[PDB]
PDB file of C-alpha atoms in Angstrom:
ATOM      1  CA  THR A 773     -10.367   2.402  39.566  1.00 31.05           C
ATOM      2  CA  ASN A 774      -8.522  -0.911  39.874  1.00 29.91           C
ATOM      3  CA  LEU A 775      -5.931   0.620  37.509  1.00 24.24           C
ATOM      4  CA  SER A 776      -5.466   4.022  39.224  1.00 21.53           C
ATOM      5  CA  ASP A 777      -4.740   1.984  42.295  1.00 26.09           C
ATOM      6  CA  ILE A 778      -1.850   0.266  40.532  1.00 27.13           C
ATOM      7  CA  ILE A 779      -0.296   3.581  39.610  1.00 28.41           C
ATOM      8  CA  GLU A 780      -0.882   5.000  43.087  1.00 27.55           C
ATOM      9  CA  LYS A 781       0.921   2.066  44.690  1.00 26.70           C
ATOM     10  CA  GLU A 782       4.012   2.217  42.452  1.00 29.18           C
ATOM     11  CA  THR A 783       4.376   6.009  42.189  1.00 27.64           C
ATOM     12  CA  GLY A 784       2.340   7.656  44.949  1.00 29.37           C
ATOM     13  CA  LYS A 785       0.255   9.722  42.515  1.00 28.83           C
ATOM     14  CA  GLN A 786      -3.502   9.609  41.853  1.00 31.92           C
ATOM     15  CA  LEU A 787      -4.484   9.988  38.218  1.00 34.70           C
ATOM     16  CA  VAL A 788      -7.451   9.282  35.960  1.00 32.66           C
ATOM     17  CA  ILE A 789      -6.829   6.661  33.234  1.00 31.24           C
ATOM     18  CA  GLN A 790      -7.449   8.138  29.788  1.00 31.81           C
ATOM     19  CA  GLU A 791      -7.580   5.290  27.274  1.00 31.37           C
ATOM     20  CA  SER A 792      -6.824   1.596  26.964  1.00 31.90           C
ATOM     21  CA  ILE A 793      -5.132   0.411  23.763  1.00 28.63           C
ATOM     22  CA  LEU A 794      -4.219  -3.215  22.983  1.00 28.72           C
ATOM     23  CA  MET A 795      -0.790  -4.333  21.720  1.00 27.35           C
ATOM     24  CA  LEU A 796       0.751  -7.604  20.556  1.00 27.37           C
ATOM     25  CA  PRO A 797       3.934  -8.779  22.276  1.00 28.68           C
ATOM     26  CA  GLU A 798       6.149  -8.016  19.237  1.00 31.95           C
ATOM     27  CA  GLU A 799       4.805  -4.469  18.962  1.00 32.69           C
ATOM     28  CA  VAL A 800       5.597  -3.522  22.569  1.00 33.11           C
ATOM     29  CA  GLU A 801       9.031  -5.243  22.658  1.00 32.93           C
ATOM     30  CA  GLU A 802      11.037  -2.232  21.438  1.00 31.29           C
ATOM     31  CA  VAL A 803       9.605   0.429  23.793  1.00 28.46           C
ATOM     32  CA  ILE A 804      10.196  -1.889  26.742  1.00 30.32           C
ATOM     33  CA  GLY A 805      13.114  -3.952  25.457  1.00 29.60           C
ATOM     34  CA  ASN A 806      11.525  -7.150  26.763  1.00 25.79           C
ATOM     35  CA  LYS A 807       8.865  -9.339  25.182  1.00 27.81           C
ATOM     36  CA  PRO A 808       5.672 -10.086  27.186  1.00 23.98           C
ATOM     37  CA  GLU A 809       4.071 -13.511  27.015  1.00 24.80           C
ATOM     38  CA  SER A 810       0.588 -12.220  26.192  1.00 24.80           C
ATOM     39  CA  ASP A 811      -1.054  -9.126  24.736  1.00 22.81           C
ATOM     40  CA  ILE A 812      -0.866  -6.070  26.962  1.00 26.18           C
ATOM     41  CA  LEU A 813      -3.138  -3.101  27.424  1.00 28.13           C
ATOM     42  CA  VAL A 814      -1.540   0.360  27.590  1.00 31.49           C
ATOM     43  CA  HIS A 815      -3.387   2.673  29.965  1.00 32.13           C
ATOM     44  CA  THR A 816      -2.382   6.310  29.497  1.00 31.30           C
ATOM     45  CA  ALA A 817      -2.471   9.028  32.136  1.00 32.10           C
ATOM     46  CA  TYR A 818      -1.021  12.457  32.785  1.00 30.54           C
ATOM     47  CA  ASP A 819       0.488  14.102  35.866  1.00 27.62           C
ATOM     48  CA  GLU A 820       0.104  17.836  35.608  1.00 28.37           C
ATOM     49  CA  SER A 821       2.124  18.722  38.710  1.00 24.19           C
ATOM     50  CA  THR A 822       5.165  17.087  37.107  1.00 28.47           C
ATOM     51  CA  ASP A 823       4.328  17.396  33.402  1.00 28.57           C
ATOM     52  CA  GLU A 824       4.612  13.647  32.956  1.00 28.44           C
ATOM     53  CA  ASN A 825       2.865  11.197  30.673  1.00 29.05           C
ATOM     54  CA  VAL A 826       2.153   7.947  32.542  1.00 34.49           C
ATOM     55  CA  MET A 827       1.745   4.606  30.804  1.00 32.42           C
ATOM     56  CA  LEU A 828       0.689   1.560  32.751  1.00 33.82           C
ATOM     57  CA  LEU A 829       0.973  -1.712  30.850  1.00 31.22           C
ATOM     58  CA  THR A 830      -1.058  -4.703  32.002  1.00 32.46           C
ATOM     59  CA  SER A 831      -2.252  -7.988  30.508  1.00 31.08           C
ATOM     60  CA  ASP A 832      -5.722  -7.939  28.863  1.00 32.32           C
ATOM     61  CA  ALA A 833      -9.062  -7.637  30.651  1.00 34.31           C
ATOM     62  CA  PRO A 834     -10.305  -8.988  32.958  1.00 35.57           C
ATOM     63  CA  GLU A 835      -6.983 -10.140  34.362  1.00 34.80           C
ATOM     64  CA  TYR A 836      -5.153  -6.786  34.222  1.00 32.34           C
ATOM     65  CA  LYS A 837      -1.869  -8.215  35.510  1.00 31.44           C
ATOM     66  CA  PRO A 838       0.680  -5.356  35.945  1.00 29.37           C
ATOM     67  CA  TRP A 839       3.728  -5.714  33.724  1.00 34.02           C
ATOM     68  CA  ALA A 840       5.437  -2.338  33.474  1.00 29.62           C
ATOM     69  CA  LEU A 841       5.116   1.383  34.108  1.00 30.04           C
ATOM     70  CA  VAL A 842       6.611   3.940  31.701  1.00 29.85           C
ATOM     71  CA  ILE A 843       7.098   7.616  32.600  1.00 24.49           C
ATOM     72  CA  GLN A 844       7.956  10.352  30.048  1.00 24.26           C
ATOM     73  CA  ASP A 845       9.129  13.754  31.357  1.00 24.07           C
ATOM     74  CA  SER A 846       9.115  17.333  30.102  1.00 22.36           C
ATOM     75  CA  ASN A 847      12.144  16.367  28.015  1.00 24.94           C
ATOM     76  CA  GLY A 848      10.498  13.391  26.277  1.00 25.12           C
ATOM     77  CA  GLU A 849      12.859  11.013  28.063  1.00 25.88           C
ATOM     78  CA  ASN A 850      11.529   7.670  29.390  1.00 25.05           C
ATOM     79  CA  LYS A 851      12.054   5.763  32.636  1.00 24.24           C
ATOM     80  CA  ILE A 852      10.797   2.187  32.834  1.00 23.87           C
ATOM     81  CA  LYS A 853       9.833   0.169  35.923  1.00 26.13           C
ATOM     82  CA  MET A 854       9.111  -3.543  35.606  1.00 24.43           C
ATOM     83  CA  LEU A 855       6.224  -4.612  37.836  1.00 24.73           C
TER      84      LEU A 855
END
């Protein structure tokens, strides 16, 4: 989809988006350590060849403006990339 495409571009991998959950700016500020100017949707995904949880954060539909990408490894350690 239009979202898979965003992940493919930033990471090279092709995944299927699982679910989209809405968050207020204040709620997502800690995980990211930055405060977005609007609500953001969290699109979860999972890379099995690397055992990684993928989380693409975008503004709300229909805009879907990319904001950040969060990757959690086998060790439960995060790596954030601002889009």
